[PDB]
């Protein structure tokens, strides 16, 4: 098995347009994810709230949908609760709250795309392991 | 194949080493207590690497030759055999720490 | 506790038989000049 | 310091031979038992009492809970030929963990 | 002598979100319910029937629409003390 | 936030799931962390009243910066592997983290231990050297030989 | 007596098969699959996210042959009892009273014979070592020659080890 | 005014406020107004366990017990609505608070009795026509006593209600019937009764204090055994305020 | 000779059947306290709420334990590292419920044993010996400290100290593996080399010396009578033993100097056990064993399991089952 | 019964310590 273009092709938006990431984008996405996100989201779970994981099925049922690049990028700018009802920038790392989550200060647009890409691709690789928790370790 | 290769050549190797202890003891003129003492490593090797899997379904459950593999063997014996509870193990522990 | 009751005699003999063995050997050693 | 001491050197060095050699031989015997699964797994009296009496707990029963965890969580990956599929819901787990 | 939880699994509780008993994390399964409506719903339980969930005080029209869209996913069974005590509807000791 | 009354939530053991009393009555966090109730920190103290954690302050006065702080510290517990994989020993590779506190505490425990050993070594040697027998027993002057038998 | 063969089925009438206990395990979960090995039912540990409970899956058991021939049970506790027994293979009625049996498995004469003789074989290996040594080293049993020449044991003095004629 | 550092470790955190002995006043109830208990504090001082007779025809008595779980017993920060009824009686409805404490007391001979000392869902009322709370006002009420362990609790063999084994796995071929009471966990929900005798009133501050007596069942270990009857005596404090 | 001088002379007297000494003055009462409390508690102590969740664990013989399952149970998690002497309890019954005996015993014991070490130095000084036997003893001592004191300090509770019992010891080991992966810690591995090596060299030295005993006896008598206590001449031939072992391996892997040999015998297990003790003491601050969980990944990113990952599975079983009722939140951080 | 047995054996061992220490064969220099 290898990291093919097919694996690296992920939904861009909700209209069903796709984007194909480079291997470099994927790996950058992995590095940046480890940098800014993995302290809470290692393996696609959420340590400070295990009810919400990063499985693509979970992301698809978020409001607005987060199972595509645009949804995830927007989330990293302006995170909401799962039902979209509340803006949670003040307790969740985001560009909007880069003043209180300083690691977000040196993320660029292209970075947000890479991180989003990593989150979308990883479950295509790891299956149940992604968002599964210790049961699948 | 390398597992049986190593385990078997290893067995005969141990036999060879203890024969070596006897041979040299006899040539030099000392009593063969070193060989006799070496009976204990041979008992361990033979019981753990040969007899134990022979009692089980297959070689698969013998120890694998590696550091972490052996750790796994330990944890397996705790979980499946409750080996720490075994008074024969306890006597072994007493012998080694003693 | 529902222990095996034979344990009792098993333990008793386990202690007494070999211990007595030793004691016999020791005493007749002392009684030699 | 200790109450007793060696006084015989030959006996001392023999004893140094004797202790670890004998220990290893004993462990060997135990493993020969485990070849047949002839284990020292349980204390039957403990199990009868604990089965009847849900407030009876010892380090022995505690360790059995640990063993049960080890088996359930390591068996499928450790014994791939068995094809163990253990759904999440059957895995023994304490609260939260 | 019966385990009441096992028994409850043989009712609609083992098929759908039971407005009267089910832990709040379950509302994650459908769009729009978590956390806001889920909180409202668990707070205002128990309910005599599913459509009673539409009578919760304060609900916006949006929330009513979401609820209407999800009624088929909902059920109600008799409150089971074992499932609702301990605050277990909010946190039932299950994480990942 | 989800609507739990944390003050009255009975945990599985019968002890409060979130809150319980310390052995001297102070209101403290529950779970295993009951052991850590002596902890004081700037992010927690505003929730503290005369009797320990104050339930009304908990219900009304928890600020977002406190939630942030608690999440950060919880996800940076001083646990990690020797090759700097952060987390419990069963955590998968991902987070390159071992706390400075662990590095410092372990290093200095090791150092302190060996320096205690060095103290034993050199103190004992110093005594022996001063008294004149650090090179061994004088055969013709062996102290024990001039002592009565113990029995 | 044989209770007869237990056939488990689910609500959809699929035949299910209990995963048999491997000899390694003192205890074993109760798991039911279809012929293709797909998990279709089980006895859950945590109930709160159970998807395969006998109750959810409507698991029944029917018996063919044995004392329970022709009978079907549909109440979850009973069906579960029989599934628990089913991990042990065929199901039997036992008189547990006469001997005050404690419910815990014991090995057979095959087991005990094998154990005793493997152990005795191993110990007797040591016996062979000990007496073989005493036979071949009879001359040094009480100790070595007080007049052992240091040059017989030091290197190079003799060309052939132990052979004083090769100095 | 004492702070946390004044109190910590002293045992004072488990004590309820008392009122001065001068507090024999009266706190007027305006039947047109809605009232609230802002803090109800219950400090137990004695735990009595009903002894269980052999002949069952003699009288059972309450024996004293020894508290072994230290100063972890008081209920506090309990709050709820205080309603004036049609007949002038007042009804406290408990809403929330630290309204339970597991307690283990020990009987002579060594038997430990665990109980969930609680006033969960307390509803309590006074005599009719209480125009003022006074040192002759008293509340009588009922409360819920849930199972001392909740559904997730696992016994030492890993059996439980919402989790755990459903059999005695260490005895694989034992007859299950004899073990049913231990294998099948049950969650009890019972009722307790309580009397609050108001002994002190600060009509200025709306503060009342007094003594209480409660009766409830003890831990039945999830149906494994019969619970004991327990009578708890102690003192209480409450601050009333307009809501 | 006044009374204080007389007392000092008796205390430091090399004529007492058992040496007392100034360390002994602390050692004797502390060890007696620990010993008496331990025996009484092991037989008759009621169940102890070790983890502080009102779930008492039975440790004594009278309460359904045998020699193997019995223990003096660690003091309650609710106490943490608080000092819990008898007089801090409202009653003895309270004290017993909360596991006070554990604290009394381990504090008195650790004191007594430290003083045992000091006493070894002390008698060595009164006898005109070289001083370092105590340094050897510092290795098991440190170990005791590791499991009775340092580990609780780091984890914040004596409830996580080693229980005083056989099965309790096994519990502590298993849980330790779950939370620190001690097998994958090089200090534990050095410990294992220390005790395996120590045993090996014990049997080695025993057997070589025995093999080279000079003949002094007939076949019908014990060879041991060939040695007489206090004799000036060596009882075996170290040149013969050296010739033998040197041919067994090669010449330069055999000791010909008894001093340097015996020093090796001393040093190897002592250094090893020092490392084992440091292992426990540093894992007390959660600097844990090597973690190679999912270290090997294929071209696509599939996890390729190694033996490390199997170990992790077993570790997970331990972690999730241990103290099954004591955790409310998803991470077990101490 | 078991308890009595365990404590008995233990007690015998302690008695044995006493004798092995104070009523030992004296080491005699020769
Ligand atoms: C005579 C017979 C006696 C025999 C007894 C033997 C006992 C000693 C055995 C020692 C064995 C050492 C093997 C080292 C294996 C190795 O390859 O070690 C590898 C590790 C690094 O491992 C890497 O560590 C990485 C860490 O990941 C983390 O970090 C990464 C980026 O750094 C990523 O961010 C990743 O997402 C994140 O999870 C990953 O796990 C990699 O997969 C993994 O390969 O080296 C490190 O940790 C380096 C720092 C620690 C080295 C410690 C050396 C040993 C210390 C004691 C030695 C004796 C001391 C005595 C002196 C007196
Ligand atoms: C071995 C067998 C060989 C033969 C025997 C040799 C005997 C001596 C062995 C010495 C070690 C040899 C290997 C050295 C390689 C190494 O270590 O490599 C590891 C690092 C360099 O690798 C870097 O190691 C880092 C370690 O993480 C650190 O950096 C990270 C990223 O910033 C995080 O901040 C993380 O929290 C922080 O801990 C990261 O993983 C980086 O990705 C990685 O590149 O070397 C360093 O750190 C420098 C370390 C200097 C000494 C520090 C001593 C600290 C005292 C601890 C004592 C504790 C108790 C003992 C326990 C045993
Ligand atoms: C207090 C801690 C402790 C101690 C001191 C022991 C001690 C022992 N354990 Mg136990 N163990 C423990 C805790 C402990 N255990 C715990 C908590 C568990 C979990 C249940 C276990 C699980 C366990 C298992 C599964 C086994 C043991 C075994 C043993 C015995 C091994 C003897 C040996 O040296 O084999 C070492 C191996 C040999 C001596 C074989 C011969 C070796 C040859 C000579 C090597 C020659 C190699 C050559 C030089 C080449 C080197 C190449 C190089 C590159 C590597 C010994 C009595 C073993 C046993 O009982 O065997 C009968 C065993 O199988 N233990
Ligand atoms: C007070 C001592 C101390 C402490 C607490 C730290 C802590 C740290 N160092 Mg620093 N450092 C130190 C001294 C220390 N260092 C020294 C003396 C040097 C010069 C060699 C360095 C040079 C250095 C570099 C170049 C780097 C660090 C880094 C780090 C971080 C990662 C450490 C790591 O992964 O090691 C891995 C763990 C080991 C290698 C374990 C070593 C085991 C030793 C050999 C055991 C020795 C035991 C004892 C002394 C021997 C007794 C023998 C007996 C017979 C008597 C960590 C914060 C890294 C970092 O992240 O910087 C930002 C990094 O890149 N350190
Ligand atoms: C793991 C622990 C352990 C090891 C590694 C070990 C190793 C050794 N013991 C030896 C001797 C002894 N050991 C003895 C008592 C003990 N030995 C013990 C435990 C060990 N002993 C213990 C606990 C005792 C107490 C009774 C005595 C009395 C002796 C000796 O007289 C002898 C010696 O000379 O010591 C200085 C040497 C035998 C040389 C030889 O056979 O060459 C021949 C090599 C052969 C035949 C190859 C063997 C193949 C093995 C059996 C299987 C393959 C192993 C792989 C190559 C490596 C696997 C590594 C993974 C497991 C990680 C060797 C250094
Ligand atoms: C109230 C009650 C019931 C409480 C009970 C509490 C409790 C838990 C009970 C404990 C139960 C328990 C102890 C069970 C342990 C069982 C156990 C596993 C034993 C195994 C027995 C068995 C046969 C093992 C086989 C292996 C074997 C032979 C081991 C023997 C180990 C052994 C005795 C080692 C010796 C240790 C020792 C301290 C030796 C000291 C020797 C010594 C004085 C050296 C000093 C010295 C050195 C010199 O170099 C010189 C020159 C001289 C001059 C000199 O003297
Ligand atoms: C078809 C074909 C190939 C046939 C060939 C057959 C044939 C003719 C071959 C001949 C040709 C030939 C030899 C080829 C060799 C090929 C080859 C290299 C094979 C090698 C096999 C192999 C790898 C061997 C490994 C053996 C091994 C690992 C040994 C390790 C040795 C080692 C680590 C020893 C360290 C331990 C040691 C120093 C212990 C000392 C400490 C100890 C306490 C000792 C106690 C002690 C010591 C004393 O000293 C004295 C004094 C006294 C009192 C005493 O207490
Ligand atoms: C529950 C409560 C229990 C309370 C128990 C309290 C007991 C107190 C009363 C004790 C009465 C005497 C007992 C001691 C007898 C004795 O040892 O004599 C033996 C010799 C003889 O004394 C010698 O005695 C001589 C006088 S005479 O010969 O005995 O008449 C004298 O001249 C000489 O100087 C002197 O050394 O005494 C000595 O060697 C010096 C004192 C040694 C003390 C050792 C104590 C070590 C305790 C270790 C604790 C851990 C043990 C755990 C179990 C393994
Ligand atoms: C301050 C006080 C500190 C010490 C107090 C406690 C001291 C206890 C000492 C043990 C005395 C019993 C020795 C009997 C045997 C005895 O008297 O030995 C005497 C013997 C003397 O040897 P010799 O060289 O003089 O004998 C030569 C000839 O007899 C050979 O035939 O010493 C040894 O053999 C040492 C090796 C065995 C030492 C074994 C010690 C094991 C520790 C005990 C473990 C069991 C504990 C179980 C607990 C439940
Ligand atoms: C811990 C402090 C966190 C860090 C660091 C990051 N995230 Fe997070 N994330 C966290 C929580 C507690 C939650 C739940 C928030 C809520 O109440 O709704 C989340 C959620 C997300 C989500 C949504 C998950 C879903 O809808 O199923 C996403 C997509 C997400 N987080 C992404 C994310 C990224 C990309 C991060 C690094 C830049 C990151 N998070 C950091 C906790 C924490
Ligand atoms: C308001 O919310 C912002 C994020 O939305 C933060 O950056 C800021 O710190 C906070 O005060
Ligand atoms: C509620 C139980 C109904 C089903 C009966 C249980 C399965 S069968 C049952 O198993 C026992 C072993 O536990 C045997 O001793 C007994 O003979 C047998 O009838
Ligand atoms: O092992 Mn896991 O981690 Ca050290 O605490 Mn948290 O649970 Mn508990 O108190 Mn004993 O133990
Ligand atoms: Ca009144
Ligand atoms: Cl917790
Ligand atoms: Cl545990």
mmCIF file with all atom_site columns, N, CA and C in Angstrom, chain I residues 145-169:
data_model
loop_
_atom_site.group_PDB
_atom_site.id
_atom_site.type_symbol
_atom_site.label_atom_id
_atom_site.label_alt_id
_atom_site.label_comp_id
_atom_site.label_asym_id
_atom_site.label_entity_id
_atom_site.label_seq_id
_atom_site.pdbx_PDB_ins_code
_atom_site.Cartn_x
_atom_site.Cartn_y
_atom_site.Cartn_z
_atom_site.occupancy
_atom_site.B_iso_or_equiv
_atom_site.pdbx_formal_charge
_atom_site.auth_seq_id
_atom_site.auth_comp_id
_atom_site.auth_asym_id
_atom_site.auth_atom_id
_atom_site.pdbx_PDB_model_num
ATOM 1  N N  . UNK I 1 145 ? 13.057 2.085   49.825 1.00 0.00 ? 145 UNK I N  1
ATOM 2  C CA . UNK I 1 145 ? 12.655 3.490   49.857 1.00 0.00 ? 145 UNK I CA 1
ATOM 3  C C  . UNK I 1 145 ? 11.853 3.816   48.611 1.00 0.00 ? 145 UNK I C  1
ATOM 4  N N  . UNK I 1 146 ? 12.236 3.184   47.503 1.00 0.00 ? 146 UNK I N  1
ATOM 5  C CA . UNK I 1 146 ? 11.623 3.502   46.241 1.00 0.00 ? 146 UNK I CA 1
ATOM 6  C C  . UNK I 1 146 ? 10.168 3.106   46.290 1.00 0.00 ? 146 UNK I C  1
ATOM 7  N N  . UNK I 1 147 ? 9.861  1.961   46.903 1.00 0.00 ? 147 UNK I N  1
ATOM 8  C CA . UNK I 1 147 ? 8.517  1.431   46.690 1.00 0.00 ? 147 UNK I CA 1
ATOM 9  C C  . UNK I 1 147 ? 7.585  1.786   47.847 1.00 0.00 ? 147 UNK I C  1
ATOM 10 N N  . UNK I 1 148 ? 8.165  2.269   48.936 1.00 0.00 ? 148 UNK I N  1
ATOM 11 C CA . UNK I 1 148 ? 7.413  2.556   50.146 1.00 0.00 ? 148 UNK I CA 1
ATOM 12 C C  . UNK I 1 148 ? 7.303  4.057   50.359 1.00 0.00 ? 148 UNK I C  1
ATOM 13 N N  . UNK I 1 149 ? 8.224  4.808   49.771 1.00 0.00 ? 149 UNK I N  1
ATOM 14 C CA . UNK I 1 149 ? 8.237  6.230   50.029 1.00 0.00 ? 149 UNK I CA 1
ATOM 15 C C  . UNK I 1 149 ? 8.282  7.105   48.762 1.00 0.00 ? 149 UNK I C  1
ATOM 16 N N  . UNK I 1 150 ? 9.289  6.907   47.922 1.00 0.00 ? 150 UNK I N  1
ATOM 17 C CA . UNK I 1 150 ? 9.495  7.822   46.803 1.00 0.00 ? 150 UNK I CA 1
ATOM 18 C C  . UNK I 1 150 ? 8.336  7.746   45.807 1.00 0.00 ? 150 UNK I C  1
ATOM 19 N N  . UNK I 1 151 ? 7.977  6.528   45.441 1.00 0.00 ? 151 UNK I N  1
ATOM 20 C CA . UNK I 1 151 ? 6.863  6.356   44.525 1.00 0.00 ? 151 UNK I CA 1
ATOM 21 C C  . UNK I 1 151 ? 5.564  7.003   45.064 1.00 0.00 ? 151 UNK I C  1
ATOM 22 N N  . UNK I 1 152 ? 5.187  6.744   46.339 1.00 0.00 ? 152 UNK I N  1
ATOM 23 C CA . UNK I 1 152 ? 4.043  7.518   46.844 1.00 0.00 ? 152 UNK I CA 1
ATOM 24 C C  . UNK I 1 152 ? 4.227  9.035   46.754 1.00 0.00 ? 152 UNK I C  1
ATOM 25 N N  . UNK I 1 153 ? 5.439  9.531   46.990 1.00 0.00 ? 153 UNK I N  1
ATOM 26 C CA . UNK I 1 153 ? 5.616  10.971  47.002 1.00 0.00 ? 153 UNK I CA 1
ATOM 27 C C  . UNK I 1 153 ? 5.336  11.523  45.613 1.00 0.00 ? 153 UNK I C  1
ATOM 28 N N  . UNK I 1 154 ? 5.868  10.845  44.605 1.00 0.00 ? 154 UNK I N  1
ATOM 29 C CA . UNK I 1 154 ? 5.682  11.277  43.239 1.00 0.00 ? 154 UNK I CA 1
ATOM 30 C C  . UNK I 1 154 ? 4.253  11.124  42.758 1.00 0.00 ? 154 UNK I C  1
ATOM 31 N N  . UNK I 1 155 ? 3.558  10.099  43.236 1.00 0.00 ? 155 UNK I N  1
ATOM 32 C CA . UNK I 1 155 ? 2.211  9.842   42.723 1.00 0.00 ? 155 UNK I CA 1
ATOM 33 C C  . UNK I 1 155 ? 1.167  10.470  43.625 1.00 0.00 ? 155 UNK I C  1
ATOM 34 N N  . UNK I 1 156 ? 1.640  11.046  44.725 1.00 0.00 ? 156 UNK I N  1
ATOM 35 C CA . UNK I 1 156 ? 0.803  11.806  45.632 1.00 0.00 ? 156 UNK I CA 1
ATOM 36 C C  . UNK I 1 156 ? 0.017  11.024  46.667 1.00 0.00 ? 156 UNK I C  1
ATOM 37 N N  . UNK I 1 157 ? 0.326  9.739   46.864 1.00 0.00 ? 157 UNK I N  1
ATOM 38 C CA . UNK I 1 157 ? -0.440 8.953   47.828 1.00 0.00 ? 157 UNK I CA 1
ATOM 39 C C  . UNK I 1 157 ? 0.253  7.678   48.266 1.00 0.00 ? 157 UNK I C  1
ATOM 40 N N  . UNK I 1 158 ? 0.190  7.386   49.563 1.00 0.00 ? 158 UNK I N  1
ATOM 41 C CA . UNK I 1 158 ? 0.729  6.125   50.070 1.00 0.00 ? 158 UNK I CA 1
ATOM 42 C C  . UNK I 1 158 ? -0.121 4.950   49.624 1.00 0.00 ? 158 UNK I C  1
ATOM 43 N N  . UNK I 1 159 ? -1.324 5.275   49.148 1.00 0.00 ? 159 UNK I N  1
ATOM 44 C CA . UNK I 1 159 ? -2.227 4.271   48.613 1.00 0.00 ? 159 UNK I CA 1
ATOM 45 C C  . UNK I 1 159 ? -1.647 3.653   47.351 1.00 0.00 ? 159 UNK I C  1
ATOM 46 N N  . UNK I 1 160 ? -0.628 4.298   46.779 1.00 0.00 ? 160 UNK I N  1
ATOM 47 C CA . UNK I 1 160 ? 0.057  3.721   45.626 1.00 0.00 ? 160 UNK I CA 1
ATOM 48 C C  . UNK I 1 160 ? 1.432  3.168   45.976 1.00 0.00 ? 160 UNK I C  1
ATOM 49 N N  . UNK I 1 161 ? 1.750  3.112   47.271 1.00 0.00 ? 161 UNK I N  1
ATOM 50 C CA . UNK I 1 161 ? 2.952  2.434   47.745 1.00 0.00 ? 161 UNK I CA 1
ATOM 51 C C  . UNK I 1 161 ? 2.768  0.925   47.638 1.00 0.00 ? 161 UNK I C  1
ATOM 52 N N  . UNK I 1 162 ? 3.846  0.145   47.756 1.00 0.00 ? 162 UNK I N  1
ATOM 53 C CA . UNK I 1 162 ? 3.731  -1.290  47.623 1.00 0.00 ? 162 UNK I CA 1
ATOM 54 C C  . UNK I 1 162 ? 2.996  -1.839  48.848 1.00 0.00 ? 162 UNK I C  1
ATOM 55 N N  . UNK I 1 163 ? 1.989  -2.686  48.620 1.00 0.00 ? 163 UNK I N  1
ATOM 56 C CA . UNK I 1 163 ? 1.322  -3.294  49.775 1.00 0.00 ? 163 UNK I CA 1
ATOM 57 C C  . UNK I 1 163 ? 2.274  -4.244  50.485 1.00 0.00 ? 163 UNK I C  1
ATOM 58 N N  . UNK I 1 164 ? 2.101  -4.438  51.790 1.00 0.00 ? 164 UNK I N  1
ATOM 59 C CA . UNK I 1 164 ? 2.915  -5.364  52.555 1.00 0.00 ? 164 UNK I CA 1
ATOM 60 C C  . UNK I 1 164 ? 2.318  -6.760  52.495 1.00 0.00 ? 164 UNK I C  1
ATOM 61 N N  . UNK I 1 165 ? 2.488  -7.415  51.360 1.00 0.00 ? 165 UNK I N  1
ATOM 62 C CA . UNK I 1 165 ? 1.923  -8.728  51.162 1.00 0.00 ? 165 UNK I CA 1
ATOM 63 C C  . UNK I 1 165 ? 2.387  -9.277  49.833 1.00 0.00 ? 165 UNK I C  1
ATOM 64 N N  . UNK I 1 166 ? 2.286  -10.585 49.690 1.00 0.00 ? 166 UNK I N  1
ATOM 65 C CA . UNK I 1 166 ? 2.764  -11.254 48.502 1.00 0.00 ? 166 UNK I CA 1
ATOM 66 C C  . UNK I 1 166 ? 1.930  -10.875 47.251 1.00 0.00 ? 166 UNK I C  1
ATOM 67 N N  . UNK I 1 167 ? 0.620  -11.129 47.323 1.00 0.00 ? 167 UNK I N  1
ATOM 68 C CA . UNK I 1 167 ? -0.240 -10.820 46.191 1.00 0.00 ? 167 UNK I CA 1
ATOM 69 C C  . UNK I 1 167 ? -0.315 -9.320  45.979 1.00 0.00 ? 167 UNK I C  1
ATOM 70 N N  . UNK I 1 168 ? -0.189 -8.563  47.071 1.00 0.00 ? 168 UNK I N  1
ATOM 71 C CA . UNK I 1 168 ? -0.176 -7.111  47.023 1.00 0.00 ? 168 UNK I CA 1
ATOM 72 C C  . UNK I 1 168 ? 1.012  -6.608  46.218 1.00 0.00 ? 168 UNK I C  1
ATOM 73 N N  . UNK I 1 169 ? 2.151  -7.260  46.432 1.00 0.00 ? 169 UNK I N  1
ATOM 74 C CA . UNK I 1 169 ? 3.342  -7.006  45.650 1.00 0.00 ? 169 UNK I CA 1
ATOM 75 C C  . UNK I 1 169 ? 3.047  -7.261  44.181 1.00 0.00 ? 169 UNK I C  1
#
